Amino acid sequence: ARLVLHEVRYVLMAMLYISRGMAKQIQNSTIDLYVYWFLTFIPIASLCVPQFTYLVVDTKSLIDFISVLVPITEILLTNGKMIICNVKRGKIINLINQVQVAWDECAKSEHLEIQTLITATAKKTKIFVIIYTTSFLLICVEYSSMPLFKLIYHSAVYGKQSNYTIALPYLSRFAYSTESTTSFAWTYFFILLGVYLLALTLSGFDSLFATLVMHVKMMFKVLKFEIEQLGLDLSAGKSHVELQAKLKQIILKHKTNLSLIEQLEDGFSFFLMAQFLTSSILVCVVLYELTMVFGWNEDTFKTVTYLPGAILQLFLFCWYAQQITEEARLVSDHIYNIPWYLADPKLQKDILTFMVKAQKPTGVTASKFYMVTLQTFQRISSTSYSYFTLLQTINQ
Amino acid sequence: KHQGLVADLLPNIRVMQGVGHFMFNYYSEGKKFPHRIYCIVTLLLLLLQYGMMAVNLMMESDDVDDLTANTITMLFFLHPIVKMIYFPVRSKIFYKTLAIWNNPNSHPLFAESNARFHALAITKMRRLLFCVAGATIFSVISWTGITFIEDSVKRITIIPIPRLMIRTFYPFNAMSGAGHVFALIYQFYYLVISMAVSNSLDVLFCSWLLFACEQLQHLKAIMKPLMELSATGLTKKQEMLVRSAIKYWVERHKHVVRLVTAVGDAYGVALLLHMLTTTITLTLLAYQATKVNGVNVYAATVIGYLLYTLGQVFLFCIFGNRLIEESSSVMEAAYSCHWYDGSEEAKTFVQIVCQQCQKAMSISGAKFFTVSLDLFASVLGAVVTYFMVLVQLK
Amino acid sequence: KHQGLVADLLPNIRVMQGVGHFMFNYYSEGKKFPHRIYCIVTLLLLLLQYGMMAVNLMMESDDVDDLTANTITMLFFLHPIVKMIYFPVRSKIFYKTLAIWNNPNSHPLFAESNARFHALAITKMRRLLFCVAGATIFSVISWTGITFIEDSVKRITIIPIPRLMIRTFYPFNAMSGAGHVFALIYQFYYLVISMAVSNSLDVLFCSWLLFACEQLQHLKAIMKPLMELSATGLTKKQEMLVRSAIKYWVERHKHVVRLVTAVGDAYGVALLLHMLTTTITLTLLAYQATKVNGVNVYAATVIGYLLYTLGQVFLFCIFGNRLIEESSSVMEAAYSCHWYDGSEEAKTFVQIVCQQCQKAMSISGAKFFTVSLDLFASVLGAVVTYFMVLVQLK
Amino acid sequence: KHQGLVADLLPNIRVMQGVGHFMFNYYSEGKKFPHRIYCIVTLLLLLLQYGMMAVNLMMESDDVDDLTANTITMLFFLHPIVKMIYFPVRSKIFYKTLAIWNNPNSHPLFAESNARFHALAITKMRRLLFCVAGATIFSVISWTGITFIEDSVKRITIIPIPRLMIRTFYPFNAMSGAGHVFALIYQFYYLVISMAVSNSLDVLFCSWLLFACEQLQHLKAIMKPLMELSATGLTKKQEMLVRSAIKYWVERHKHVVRLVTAVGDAYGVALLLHMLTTTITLTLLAYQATKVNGVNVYAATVIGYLLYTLGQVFLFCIFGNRLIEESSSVMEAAYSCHWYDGSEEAKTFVQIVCQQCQKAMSISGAKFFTVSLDLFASVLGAVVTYFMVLVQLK
Ligand SMILES: Cc1nc(C)c(C)s1
């Protein structure tokens, strides 16, 4: 019953972002707030601070700068997402609860089309969440845990005969020494813990946005079905009161969908702005790294796996914002297609107000700067290309 | 063949089929089997020559000028192959689009205008087809003439390159009589077929748009007398007649909207691909134009490439802009009638029609842009600014 | 010269005819024969002079600076030739536009406001005509003075170039003899005639726009008391009066829309050609300004060229933007009346008027752009950015 | 200082007067004479010091880096001079704006919300004033510290330059003697007064915008129960009550529209001039940032200049965007109520309000641009692009 964002609920719980995720009325509690703040500060100490210190201390060329900037960009963006979503937990939980309420309302319907919509949406949600989380967890594991795998392989194959001096993951500078085995082990353990938290944050929040957009689209399709039922009722030739009531219910459903979109925009405005700002640089830096070390190397493998991840991360938000916009827009077409000419002029004026509202553009803005649509994917992408070319000019 | 939108566009369908554009749907089953092989063969030959060109691009990869020229040719000849492969995979939506107007609405009062505008649309479609066919034939003839007048020489010292219409590496000698004539004939056939395929698909798209625009014109023209029919405190007969007229208008408008949506799906994906190729083509062409210094052959070739690319873009854009302006004009024509003398029902119908027409119909390249003269203006401005910056950098 | 919109513009038409803008339509038939000849002669002379300018460019093309200056002058003096040839070929649409307002509407209650705003429009038209004529006279005087204060010297070694207002090659010795004075008078006549013809056509366009804007102002002013007339239930006479007022308002709005469309059809291609020439002129002028060092003669000439070009563009844009603003503000004028106290018919009329005003009337350059202060801002930004790039590159 | 919108802004008016922004309108006549003199004196000193900077820029133009730095400083300190001169010439429109809300609307049912939102607006205005004042003080302190931590040295060989906050040529020896301390105090006064005048005018503009936004919020809040009042057939008293409520809503919206129009009239040219100066400042600042290598004092100064300029632009754009968003959201507020259960009159009221709210109120810089976060993004992207071009071309 509560399968609404079931996999996303599991991912959130694994983060300790929400304790009792599997409830039908997820409750905001201060204990989760403070535990998640502590878990938010863990990556900053383990990942952000050492890597930034290395960037602003030990960087000695442009190639080293780009190499250090490839992972730290995404790490910093993920920490920002940690903080933003911890701050907005109330709105996010309210949005999830309202989506659950709408899903429960829909599941009571007896129309086969609605039931097919419900099943299709559930399957889409599950598949998308699983694929996204698996891909990004694999990316993070490849980037962070490679030395451990190499050490295990060397110990298994060469035993203690050959020597393979293990080194830490992506370069960083630590205030304390790590030469000692105990300090090295503790630092690596906390690095892995921070990496796990960051991977879960990225996967869970991106999947939450995509899945909420999917459910909003499903609710819009339910509204379309209701409008078609109103049109059939108009053709059947019923009384004025019945059509008035049907139009009122359709208007209420439209208002509910608009409220859901408003809550999503409020929750994810700054999220999207930071995401686009970071991706603009991330795609460029990853592409430059890929062209710098292309060959039969582990770096080539890591960069080739990373680049599609970032590109699809940007395309996710662009595509689903476009879906929100277009689905909201099509309501005017759905209301124009019914035989409104058969209705009394009063109901026609009500339909006219409905259509006046339904035509206003709707969607999620990039922190009020602009509305996010599919075309944005080009814009940001083009920007990335610019930076990329710049780097080449600097080299030669 | 005996239904609307395929009886009107039948000559274009036949032209498409003749050049080897699949379309195994609008003839007797007897020709269904033979024609298929022909189509396949054509594609084969096309691909063959295409591959035969690509291989050459490898040998001439050392230099940069010939690399740019070969890349421009490769994109130019990529267009038709992309269109040819694109049609069969999306054939179902194309056939759905061509069957949209089999059963249109009809009203006794608006039959004359409907027939007049249908005939006008057919005439304009025929004119567009003939004009594009003439342009393609002229392009082929000018290409061949340019190849024959211009000197075939390679700068390394002067090494005489084969005097063939398209640069290509051939296992044949390509210099003796037999190989030279075979290559000339094959390249002539290849050019004709590629140009015809690309331009015929584009003309089909533009003919759909022309039909939509003419239907919108008919809607406005018959909207003008609709209100005067309403304007006159009406007897039940007049109320029913006005309701029937309003129903006819609204249903026809919705039919036009459906046609526009189907065309938008199909050739919106097609247009995304087309403009994705055209952007790189225009960038390389601007770089090439940077090197023009009045030489007849080089300047003529660069001008021809630019003219062809910009002409394809401009055709798409002009017809899209016509559709947009026709929808906005539907709004304006709704306003400019005697609605103040009509009844509340007619006034509400006008209000809702204008509100719907606030947003004009358009065709988008898969939601990444909209085809209009604004898109052509953006393309021209980008290429011109890039050329200015490039020439200054030199 | 008796009907509206031609009696109002009669000074402009007379100026146009005087300088040679054909226009064999608005005087006694007796003058049709002689005047025509004069016009032809002027055109000949213009082209005649233009010819020797082009020839001067051919042998002055060895260097880049002189070639750039000659090209800038050639485009500057191409403008008027294009306008002069453009008017007679499209004279039919021009005469249709000038006869659009021969039969306007009339309502007893709104007659006084109509007369007041018509008088205001006439005064504004005359003011614009006088201002543009003064600007042209000032430009001619400045050109004649600057050609004399500066030193006529050519750098090769120092060669005495003829002291002429416009660079030009003459078969005769136009240095010190009677050829010099003859060339001076001929070039003065050429300058005056070309500038006057160009500016007169531009002022005719802008005066059409002024008339439309004043009519919109009248529409809003009378919208204010129309609702009060409706609000006051209403007897049959009062309902009829409200209906008549609404009919008058709607029909006058439609008439203004017709006038705007006619003006756009008449002048779209002219605007497109003007901006096409400008773009290149401004590019070459940015290159010229890149070489300015001091407050010497060269800086003055470059600044004058830039000022004249940007002034033409700015005039077109200001009047286009004024039309846009008036058309938009019709909606605010419709909202600001006491429509809540009116009847149902008046409220529906207000609703439909706002619906229609949701989009502003504008003049487009053959559907490629629109004339507004945004267009002028874009042009200025483009030229400034090109100047900055040119400075950086060198 | 007794009526609305002037008692609300009274701290701002007093700050403006204290810094010398004229404003001889809102105190006792007895103070009219002395205060005026003080203002004049301030201006004199400003110009005096300004002149001494320009003189310093004349003999510092031998080099390019120093010329660029001097130009940036001169534009930065031209901002306040332009604003200070701009206010008195346009004092009429400013005083008309400040007296717009002297006679506002009132309805018993919406009085409490009106008072609450008025108080909220006052608090927000005070918060904005204090924030801007604190930012100005921090800027002054940072300048006065950076002048001292850095080393006063000139590269020619090392020439010990006087240690002053602002580069300037002084007839007296302003290095070690009493001239040094006098120059330091004078420069501190100049900095404080210039920043204060500029930021105070900007804060007045933003406070007008804040008042408009809060009034729009009040309008939406009372829109919510207006329909509840309408929905309930209706007796004559109830119909009259709904009519009065609709009249109140529409008239208050029109008053907000008038206030926005007056603010635009007052400050459009000021915004245009501010952005004109900014553009050049940001160009020179991009060139300066091109030379940043390290975390030394030069980087701090460049970062401070960029931060201050972009902060002014960002403040203007923030409040413009807020106005746009509130005006747009009026329709979302109007739709979310139970507009379908109301009477016919209330439904037409909602319809017309939505039609009006299709467009958002905005402030434009003399019709050349609009203040919005989009404008800030465009300016930031332009400066970033210019920096990229500078680094690439070199
Ligand atoms: C390369 C990357 N490492 C982590 C921990 C990310 C979230 S991305």
Residue numbers in the entry:
A (entry chain D): 2 to 397
B (entry chain C), C (entry chain B), D (entry chain A): 4 to 159, 168 to 243, 313 to 474
Q: Which text from the study accompanies this structure?
A:
As a basis for understanding how odorants activate these heteromeric receptors, we report here cryo-EM structures of two different heteromeric odorant receptor complexes containing ORs from disease-vector mosquitos Aedes aegypti or Anopheles gambiae. We determined the structure of a heteromeric complex formed by ORs from these species in complex with a Apocrypta bakeri fig wasp Orco that is amenable to structural determination.
To determine if the 1:3 subunit stoichiometry can be observed with other members of the OR family, we turned to studying the OR28 receptor of An. gambiae, a main vector of malaria, that responds to the natural odorants acetophenone (a plant volatile) and 2,4,5-trimethylthiazole (henceforth TMT; an animal odor, originally isolated from anal secretions of mammals). A different heteromeric OR/Orco complex also has a 1:3 subunit stoichiometry and a similar mode of channel activation.
